[PDB]
Symmetry: C6
Subunit: 227 residues, 6 copies
Amino acid sequence: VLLSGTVTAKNEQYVYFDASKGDLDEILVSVGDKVSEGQALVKYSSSEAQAAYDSASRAVARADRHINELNQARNEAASAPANSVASIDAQLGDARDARADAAAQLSKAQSQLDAMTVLSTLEGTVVEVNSNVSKSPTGASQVMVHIVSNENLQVKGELSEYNLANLSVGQEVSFTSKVYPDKKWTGKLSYISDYPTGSKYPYTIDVTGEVGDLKQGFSVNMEVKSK
Amino acid sequence: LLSGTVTAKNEQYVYFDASKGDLDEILVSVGDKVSEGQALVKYSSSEAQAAYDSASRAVARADRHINELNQARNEAASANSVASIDAQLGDARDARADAAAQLSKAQSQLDAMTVLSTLEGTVVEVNSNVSKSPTGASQVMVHIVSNENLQVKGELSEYNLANLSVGQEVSFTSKVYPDKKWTGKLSYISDYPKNTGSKYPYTIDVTGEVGDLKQGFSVNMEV
Amino acid sequence: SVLLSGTVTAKNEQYVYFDASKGDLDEILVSVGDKVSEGQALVKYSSSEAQAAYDSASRAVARADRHINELNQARNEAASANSVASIDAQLGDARDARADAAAQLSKAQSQLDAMTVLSTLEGTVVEVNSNVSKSPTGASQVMVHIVSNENLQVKGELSEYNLANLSVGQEVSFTSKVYPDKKWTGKLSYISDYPKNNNTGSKYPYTIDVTGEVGDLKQGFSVNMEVKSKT
Amino acid sequence: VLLSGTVTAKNEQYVYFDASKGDLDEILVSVGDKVSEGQALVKYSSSEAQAAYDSASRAVARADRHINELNQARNEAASAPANSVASIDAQLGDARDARADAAAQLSKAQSQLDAMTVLSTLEGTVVEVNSNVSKSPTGASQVMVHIVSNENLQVKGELSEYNLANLSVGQEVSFTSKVYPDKKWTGKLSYISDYPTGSKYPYTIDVTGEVGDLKQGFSVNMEVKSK
Amino acid sequence: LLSGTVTAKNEQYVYFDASKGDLDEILVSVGDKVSEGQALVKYSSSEAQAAYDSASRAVARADRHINELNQARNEAASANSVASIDAQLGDARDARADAAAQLSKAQSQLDAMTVLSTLEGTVVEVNSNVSKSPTGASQVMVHIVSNENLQVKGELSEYNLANLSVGQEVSFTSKVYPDKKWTGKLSYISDYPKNTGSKYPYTIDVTGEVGDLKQGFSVNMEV
Amino acid sequence: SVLLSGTVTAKNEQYVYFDASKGDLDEILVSVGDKVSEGQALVKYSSSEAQAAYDSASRAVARADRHINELNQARNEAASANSVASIDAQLGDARDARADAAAQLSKAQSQLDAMTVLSTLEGTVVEVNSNVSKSPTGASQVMVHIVSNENLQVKGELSEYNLANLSVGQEVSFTSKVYPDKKWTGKLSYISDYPKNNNTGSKYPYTIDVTGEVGDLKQGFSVNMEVKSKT
């Protein structure tokens, strides 16, 4: 049995415009760069986030002071020659709670700041930048950065109803490429689906050995046995 | 003579939900077998955990206030008045009730950060690249199908609908394996067409010995 | 006489679409191919928050009543020499509080029964779908579709010519190319004055109600009809 | 010159589902009814509106009381044997203002109640009801009731680039109908456009005399002169 | 040899805006002539008028407070202290400034309930039936065109673009009136195609004697 | 050598779409067919509310400074016997207020200059449109489109075959069927590893930068090219 797939990349990352994050400052990457696993890619305007952060830490510090004046007032009104120590122990409770509130909010604003710059999840090739996107429910999704890893290649395809009854997972195969009639690369079948002129099910093969000169999107061809 | 396709019966589509914050991690690839009540996708449990902790501090605050109140009754009952201290003990009891309620709501909102499977089956599609902004279309992140309790669904025409059946135990073949028969019991004939004629979908619960039969096979069986 | 084409359609139907403003879905409690009668529930959203709202509201009426009572016991104690004018004012401000508590309560009541959508007709459920998104992701998400297989009708359109030949009330016979020995009757019940929207002419929708015994006549059937003239 | 239009109605009213108004109770009209100029058509759920209204009038009444206790307290503290009369004259100002606030809001909630039932703007024929609409940005506009008046008919059409240079507004014409070859109706041209195989401009004719048996949508035909 | 169409130069599309409340009345039919700064559509001026009145009461309240303040200075300056009364007179001045600001904002939001024309011209399209809910599409309620300062717009191909012109005074005809010529001065040739070839739009400001020439006419003029 | 087709495209461009979150539009202050340089304004929204925000913010810093000062004069008066601890606390709470006032002020500053959108490049404006709606009525409303007619390029796609014959850097000649006596040169600058998305094959986008004198060569021109092999 002769099959034909196309070689795809395994790992991608898309980056869409997030309206809820405000306004884009600059995309700091160019279509062609190989980016680190943790390299930055997009920076939103981070002034409102930094301001909310500062306000949060001032709220925390003010909570700590406030409990400190309450503390002195307590240990004065107590060892007092005898307003109430309990009347402000209440306030102490309702001030430690406000302190914990401001603490949690500070951490929230902290990551609300970290969210303003988008990092990669992978080292690959940026293949698309688009700095001209709008903040409006535009009816579609506005891609801003597309990164795909050119390593751990696979080859994906489909097979007919008849064609599934021709062996399965864990099989090693070898394929050929119409642009390099000489060489043949090998692969170990990684996945066959049982979920879809004939119904078609998708297969994926993790590729063995050296990639050599195979580019993504290359049309390939194989030969395996059936039943 | 009619044709139909064998389909699974139970699925689960998880769609990215923006209201639950943002995605942290999808916990299954493709081809995995999942079971009833199993972790599938986990949103960031952060501003949810903070709300839980705040609600907890709220119930503990209500408890502190009621202690500060009934001790202040124990003082002013053997010494403003017990009337307007017992009363505010009532309103304090109310406040503690509210605190426990919104605490439970915080718990539900919390463990909702992680969606669980509703079936035992195989994962078919995972799509971790999804836009938090509205796309204008559904965005599936995970799909589960069970390859058990199969069925055959199809359509009948205005004429062959004049064959009826509440459950004729029929049986079918398909040119993938032509020397085999599979039996099934009819289960549904629609009286309402969809949308040259009006077509009416039919279903049949396949019955036993479903060996190499899987869910893409075109299928024919006449009568 | 006058001949018309038309299709067998139902008269009464109901779609229930997903509603995010009602919260989250628990169960849909109906399976496709189920008879339902007017009033039966067909979807239940999770009634948790609505429950808590009902409880907190009842406690609002409770605390409000307690307040009116304590202010009452505290007005008489002042009528035997704050002052009874201060208490009168606070009373006027606690009756308002109790009215707000009542309104809040009934809001919780109607939001509570709004977590179970009910059927508007005797009918048969033709589609159920428990796979929806929350984010007004796309268009309308039909969750349950039901339609009465009784009181069947047939509809179509009419030429500008047919409008001058036809009046509402005229009797009608019709047949179906699948049951050629079987025949039906019916009556012209609605003729539209208003047009929808190589040969020309605008088309006006008509609907007739089938009369007499309906046999194994099922919706969607193509139908050929003769409208009887009048003496 | 021979023209061909179609007879249209002049006056319509559409009624779309309004999500911001809450939930539909019932459409109280049936496709075929002739409705009054002020007849009702759709009723939304009006319990939240009535509740907000009641709350508004209680807010007004509480404002009036409040200024009355402030009033007694003033005229006591004044002719007082000599807290401050000015200190609560301030409160009186800041209570008459709250009173005016609650008044305006009460009127607002009043029309927020009147908005819960939709009335006609015309007596005509309801031609469409649709009680099965959803509260979601459905991508389209969900018509709920469509009313068109079958009187003050017009006939509308278009004409080619050549065809405009054939006289204009204020002209009387007469037309014929392929379903009644006998009769001919007359009309007085009401509008020609200068704003668009040829560009087409639209004309409308108000119809003279008796409508007789002309239905809307009837294809008509005429004869007028050019230049 | 090229063809073009005569178009108007200045228009105005009014779209229904939900944020401005709801429509009260459109004040023009079709065929009417409107002029610069003329009432066109009027939204309901109700919750806007209420906000204006409230802002006015706010400025009068700030004035009352400053009088209550400096009179309280006139008492305690020849009798807490002038310090913390002069200071709060400063903050009161601030408050009056804010009140006047939000008052002016209330005025702008008020007269925005009524949109005015930006041209002198004829009204082309009025559409009073519009859904307050989002349609998923623009909803024009009124359209104004001026039938003065006409133009001719069209497109050139990749080849005939090799005729250039910053402003060749050309002239054209059209088979509506074949025995007449209309002169025009070129005004724009795009260097950027739109979207068999790449087409480049051109414009020409028509010049004088535009008698029976109106805005739908296909037009031809070669060179 | 290797021959390729391609179209004359520009390198740098800018769309400015309507933004409701910026308020209302006043003027667009550019007409189609205008040269613009990097930094020039191209739309001005009505800066009224932003102005009022700036003013109220400056008054916030004013009143805050007044407060810190009055508390300062009032701490010394207490340091010569409320108490100076109370004043110390209020001071710590007025420095916070002044910091909030500063942050609010700069928020008003950046929102103020955000009411004038500026150009990102030397370019020519190719479309202006002052007829928009506010209600995210539909899709994206392009209000002004500008694009540099300098630094022109040509782009297209490549077969799977072409990928093995071509490297970035190779010199290129090309011509246009409208100026048949005139010829151009250029260099291969970008070859995509990643494919877009009766005969078959996936296609990979390429872009080359034109070099030397650009004549009356205008964007969109169809172009035929020869890529020089290497010794």
